[PDB]
Design a protein around this motif. Structure first.
Motif, PDB file in Angstrom:
ATOM      1  N   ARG A   1       0.883  -1.190   0.000  1.00 26.39           N
ATOM      2  CA  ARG A   1       0.000   0.000   0.000  1.00 26.39           C
ATOM      3  C   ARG A   1       0.921   1.240   0.000  1.00 26.39           C
ATOM      4  O   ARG A   1       2.137   1.145   0.301  1.00 26.39           O
TER       5      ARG A   1
ATOM      6  N   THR B   1     -10.408  -3.869  -3.694  1.00 30.87           N
ATOM      7  CA  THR B   1     -10.528  -2.614  -2.912  1.00 30.87           C
ATOM      8  C   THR B   1      -9.246  -1.797  -3.056  1.00 30.87           C
ATOM      9  O   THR B   1      -8.144  -2.330  -3.037  1.00 30.87           O
TER      10      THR B   1
ATOM     11  N   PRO C   1     -10.595  -2.120  19.162  1.00 27.08           N
ATOM     12  CA  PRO C   1     -11.903  -1.495  18.967  1.00 27.08           C
ATOM     13  C   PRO C   1     -13.103  -2.428  19.248  1.00 27.08           C
ATOM     14  O   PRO C   1     -14.151  -1.903  19.616  1.00 27.08           O
ATOM     15  N   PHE C   2     -12.928  -3.758  19.106  1.00 31.40           N
ATOM     16  CA  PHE C   2     -14.007  -4.795  19.172  1.00 31.40           C
ATOM     17  C   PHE C   2     -14.156  -5.429  20.571  1.00 31.40           C
ATOM     18  O   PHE C   2     -15.049  -6.281  20.689  1.00 31.40           O
TER      19      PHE C   2
ATOM     20  N   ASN D   1     -18.222  -0.914   9.529  1.00 35.02           N
ATOM     21  CA  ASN D   1     -16.762  -0.872   9.396  1.00 35.02           C
ATOM     22  C   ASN D   1     -16.353   0.608   9.509  1.00 35.02           C
ATOM     23  O   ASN D   1     -17.023   1.438   8.916  1.00 35.02           O
ATOM     24  N   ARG D   2     -15.267   0.884  10.225  1.00 34.81           N
ATOM     25  CA  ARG D   2     -14.703   2.246  10.427  1.00 34.81           C
ATOM     26  C   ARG D   2     -14.212   2.805   9.089  1.00 34.81           C
ATOM     27  O   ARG D   2     -14.168   4.023   8.998  1.00 34.81           O
ATOM     28  N   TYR D   3     -13.830   1.951   8.132  1.00 31.87           N
ATOM     29  CA  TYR D   3     -13.312   2.352   6.797  1.00 31.87           C
ATOM     30  C   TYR D   3     -14.172   1.678   5.735  1.00 31.87           C
ATOM     31  O   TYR D   3     -13.768   0.652   5.173  1.00 31.87           O
TER      32      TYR D   3
ATOM     33  N   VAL E   1     -15.958   0.395   2.488  1.00 29.96           N
ATOM     34  CA  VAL E   1     -15.716   0.337   1.014  1.00 29.96           C
ATOM     35  C   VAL E   1     -17.027   0.617   0.252  1.00 29.96           C
ATOM     36  O   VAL E   1     -16.956   0.975  -0.944  1.00 29.96           O
TER      37      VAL E   1
ATOM     38  N   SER F   1     -20.814  -1.870   4.707  1.00 32.90           N
ATOM     39  CA  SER F   1     -19.625  -2.664   5.102  1.00 32.90           C
ATOM     40  C   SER F   1     -19.684  -2.888   6.612  1.00 32.90           C
ATOM     41  O   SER F   1     -19.631  -1.915   7.358  1.00 32.90           O
TER      42      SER F   1
ATOM     43  N   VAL G   1     -18.778  -5.306  10.231  1.00 31.30           N
ATOM     44  CA  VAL G   1     -17.900  -6.220  10.978  1.00 31.30           C
ATOM     45  C   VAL G   1     -18.786  -7.059  11.895  1.00 31.30           C
ATOM     46  O   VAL G   1     -19.567  -6.509  12.685  1.00 31.30           O
TER      47      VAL G   1
ATOM     48  N   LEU H   1      -5.576  -7.375  13.172  1.00 30.68           N
ATOM     49  CA  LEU H   1      -6.510  -7.351  14.334  1.00 30.68           C
ATOM     50  C   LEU H   1      -6.687  -8.785  14.814  1.00 30.68           C
ATOM     51  O   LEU H   1      -7.038  -9.632  14.000  1.00 30.68           O
TER      52      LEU H   1
ATOM     53  N   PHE I   1     -13.324 -11.906  14.207  1.00 30.82           N
ATOM     54  CA  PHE I   1     -14.409 -11.211  13.494  1.00 30.82           C
ATOM     55  C   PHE I   1     -14.482 -11.783  12.084  1.00 30.82           C
ATOM     56  O   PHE I   1     -13.485 -12.344  11.544  1.00 30.82           O
TER      57      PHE I   1
ATOM     58  N   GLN J   1     -16.724 -10.477   8.169  1.00 27.18           N
ATOM     59  CA  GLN J   1     -17.165  -9.263   7.455  1.00 27.18           C
ATOM     60  C   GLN J   1     -18.395  -9.577   6.593  1.00 27.18           C
ATOM     61  O   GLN J   1     -18.537 -10.704   6.095  1.00 27.18           O
TER      62      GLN J   1
ATOM     63  N   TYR K   1     -20.138  -7.502   3.242  1.00 25.74           N
ATOM     64  CA  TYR K   1     -20.374  -6.431   2.268  1.00 25.74           C
ATOM     65  C   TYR K   1     -21.768  -6.618   1.693  1.00 25.74           C
ATOM     66  O   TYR K   1     -22.057  -7.683   1.116  1.00 25.74           O
TER      67      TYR K   1
HETATM   68  O1  LIG Z   1     -10.417   0.271  14.160  1.00 30.99           O
HETATM   69  C1  LIG Z   1     -10.727  -0.539  13.298  1.00 30.99           C
HETATM   70  C2  LIG Z   1      -9.785  -1.362  12.758  1.00 30.99           C
HETATM   71  C3  LIG Z   1     -10.148  -2.243  11.775  1.00 30.99           C
HETATM   72  N1  LIG Z   1     -11.419  -2.302  11.376  1.00 30.99           N
HETATM   73  C4  LIG Z   1     -11.763  -3.223  10.292  1.00 30.99           C
HETATM   74  O2  LIG Z   1     -11.176  -4.530  10.222  1.00 30.99           O
HETATM   75  C5  LIG Z   1     -11.016  -4.902   8.860  1.00 30.99           C
HETATM   76  C6  LIG Z   1      -9.618  -5.360   8.504  1.00 30.99           C
HETATM   77  O3  LIG Z   1      -9.530  -5.633   7.092  1.00 30.99           O
HETATM   78  P1  LIG Z   1      -9.376  -4.632   5.829  1.00 30.99           P
HETATM   79  O4  LIG Z   1      -8.797  -3.347   6.292  1.00 30.99           O
HETATM   80  O5  LIG Z   1      -8.394  -5.322   4.902  1.00 30.99           O
HETATM   81  O6  LIG Z   1     -10.916  -4.496   5.256  1.00 30.99           O
HETATM   82  P2  LIG Z   1     -11.692  -3.604   4.206  1.00 30.99           P
HETATM   83  O7  LIG Z   1     -11.605  -2.522   4.747  1.00 30.99           O
HETATM   84  O8  LIG Z   1     -11.026  -3.560   2.893  1.00 30.99           O
HETATM   85  O9  LIG Z   1     -13.072  -3.887   4.087  1.00 30.99           O
HETATM   86  C7  LIG Z   1     -11.153  -3.664   8.073  1.00 30.99           C
HETATM   87  O10 LIG Z   1     -12.390  -3.611   7.416  1.00 30.99           O
HETATM   88  C8  LIG Z   1     -11.052  -2.593   9.121  1.00 30.99           C
HETATM   89  O11 LIG Z   1     -11.621  -1.372   8.701  1.00 30.99           O
HETATM   90  C9  LIG Z   1     -12.368  -1.405  11.938  1.00 30.99           C
HETATM   91  O12 LIG Z   1     -13.575  -1.375  11.619  1.00 30.99           O
HETATM   92  N2  LIG Z   1     -11.960  -0.564  12.890  1.00 30.99           N
END
Ligand SMILES: O=c1ccn([C@@H]2O[C@H](COP(=O)(O)OP(=O)(O)O)[C@@H](O)[C@H]2O)c(=O)[nH]1
Ligand SMILES: O=c1ccn([C@@H]2O[C@H](COP(=O)(O)OP(=O)(O)O)[C@@H](O)[C@H]2O)c(=O)[nH]1
Ligand SMILES: [Fe+3]
Ligand SMILES: [Fe+3]
Ligand SMILES: [Zn+2]
Ligand SMILES: [Zn+2]
Ligand SMILES: [Zn+2]
Ligand SMILES: [Zn+2]
Lengths: 309, 301
Positions: free
Chosen positions: A267, A286, B19-20, B38-40, B42, B65, B67, B124, B128, B130, B132
């Motif tokens: 990355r 992604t 976080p979990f 999900n914090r990030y 997609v 997205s 968790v 992590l 957990f 996921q 989508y």
């Molecule tokens: O503080 C955090 C740390 C991790 N994650 C989630 O744990 C997953 C780890 O896999 P990845 O980052 O590869 O997932 P993606 O984001 O692509 O869906 C991710 O979705 C993170 O965003 C989260 O929700 N909060």
């Protein structure tokens, strides 16, 4: 030992069941000899062979003979080179010339549907041998990813009347990272991997064996400079995958255009990217960075690899 | 942020630029299973206007997205370690999330998957999985749907039903409702597919008894994969089911588990052949692998 076919995807599976630490690819190893710049030699554990056994047959499933060649391209007699990009332009040109000569030989063999040239680089993606090398599979089937590209390319050409790859290469400007008289290297709009660069000839070519000597010299430059940029864009050398997408053997195609795909697997933050549930389980990809921003960063890094441009 | 489409493959790229534990801010306390955003993400409920380019197809990154926080316990190593009751709660929670996505009626696809192992990038350590919730069907599932349909037209039956009825030599586990087997067409070093014995298209069609028996089949199968290579193996699990929200006669849900150690306990990487060419290599037959997994599975019983 045979090639099995997934009846839901059409994918193929190749089912193929010196003192310790010595390098098999150094000059003086049992199969290499001496006085060579580039060596193409039979893989010790070949996925495909000239004389494959009768395939394992099951009633609902297609199985085909593992007929072909699996070759190692020893890229230099020198063991201590980190990357292809550390070799002189003239040495990279000799590697490309030797691979093309091997393909011309395969283009005579009626059993060869496809010439697949690829390179894996980095311990982090499973490359334990440190000697610079690449691989060729001469296969009785078209690789599924290339089949999908050929079918879309064909349908576009028949529907729209022009080569789609030609149209993409002409348009690329914002994501262009490097170009010379014969090649453009760009991050595609549809990049899937964290540092992805496609290298296309500006002239429509569909087989490596169509390339002129000048085009091959300019190819060596585009490969050297693009891989040099990847080596520093993240601050440390980056593991990567390189694959040549070309037409099937043995005939040029109007509707398909050859290109090198390079997948840099760090990355922007230097974090290794692993193909996992989305990628392998769903063929979903992604990106945490736009292709446009990634092109800008590669291009900036790439300026430090240029000698005169 | 948008879903981009490769014009040569049809593949979709989601371009999106402890976080979990109990007590943390997004978790709270008193729960067995949490499904949280999900914090990030997609894909999101409120995606922006997609980045358009003239030669390419772009779609709004609309969806969810999620968790699936499997247990409040941090130091659990694998799904297989949890009691059957807790695995049933996980599967039940995931099906309830799919029932909502079905009833809301915006989403094309509910993709449930699990990544396990530091070696395949799971940093992590809290267990957990996921989800989508997507506006497109995953391209691998689309290819399976097309092949499943064409078999169905040419032959009058479900190809998945015919495969499940025939599997014996490569069967590693079965119970009243499920068969776990190494497919003839396995591509990963330890691959097991878990099918319902009744034709079911969607996770939401499973009866409670089928969910309970699924918990058993997953616990035992993953127990076997944890032990077969002599050390715990990194793996990918994905649910292949029909697009939302109606079943079909020609497509049959299954879990695919990709165990990513070779028999020697060394990591298999997807590289130039797999990622570059969609070509796969096995250095052991599926039949020999099924025998080793079934032997390991007997200890888990
Ligand atoms: O503080 C955090 C740390 C991790 N994650 C989630 O744990 C997953 C780890 O896999 P990845 O980052 O590869 O997932 P993606 O984001 O692509 O869906 C991710 O979705 C993170 O965003 C989260 O929700 N909060
Ligand atoms: O003494 C050796 C050691 C390695 N290789 C080849 O270097 C490549 C390393 O990658 P991999 O095992 O993944 O390739 P595959 O065997 O699947 O083609 C392999 O093909 C090896 O068999 C070889 O030809 N001779
Ligand atoms: Fe391509
Ligand atoms: Fe499947
Ligand atoms: Zn060497
Ligand atoms: Zn063209
Ligand atoms: Zn925790
Ligand atoms: Zn069925």
């Amino acid at each position: 030992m045979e090639i099995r076919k997934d009846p839901f995807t059409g994918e193929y599976i190749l089912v193929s069941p010196q003192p310790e630490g010595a390098c098999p690819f150094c000059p003086g190893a049992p199969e290499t000899g001496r006085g060579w710049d580039v060596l193409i030699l039979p893989n010790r554990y070949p996925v495909v062979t000239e004389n494959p056994p009768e395939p394992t047959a099951e009633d609902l499933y297609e199985v085909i003979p593992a007929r072909g060649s699996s070759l190692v391209v020893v890229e230099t007699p020198q063991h201590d080179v980190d990357d292809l990009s550390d070799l002189p332009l003239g040495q990279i040109k000799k590697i490309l010339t030797a691979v093309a000569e091997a393909q011309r030989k395969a283009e005579k063999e009626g059993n060869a549907a496809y010439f697949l040239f690829f390179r894996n680089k980095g311990k982090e993606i499973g490359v334990s041998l440190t000697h610079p090398f690449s691989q060729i599979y001469i296969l009785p089937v078209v690789p599924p990813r290339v089949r999908a590209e050929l079918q879309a390319s064909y349908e576009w050409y028949v529907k729209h009347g022009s080569c789609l790859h030609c149209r993409i290469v002409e348009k690329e400007e914002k994501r262009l990272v490097f170009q010379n008289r014969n090649w453009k290297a760009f991050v595609p709009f549809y990049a899937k991997w964290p540092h992805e660069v496609h290298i296309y000839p500006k002239r429509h070519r569909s087989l490596l064996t169509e390339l002129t000597d000048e085009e091959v010299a300019d190819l060596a430059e585009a490969l050297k400079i693009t891989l040099c940029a990847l080596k520093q864009v993240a601050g440390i050398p980056m593991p990567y995958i390189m694959v040549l997408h070309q037409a099937p053997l043995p005939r040029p195609t109007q509707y398909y255009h050859l290109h090198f795909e390079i997948y840099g697997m760090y990355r922007p933050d230097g974090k290794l990217k692993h193909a996992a549930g989305a990628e392998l389980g769903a063929s979903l990809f992604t990106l945490d960075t736009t292709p446009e921003e990634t092109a800008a960063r590669i291009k900036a890094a790439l300026q430090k690899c240029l000698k005169h441009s």
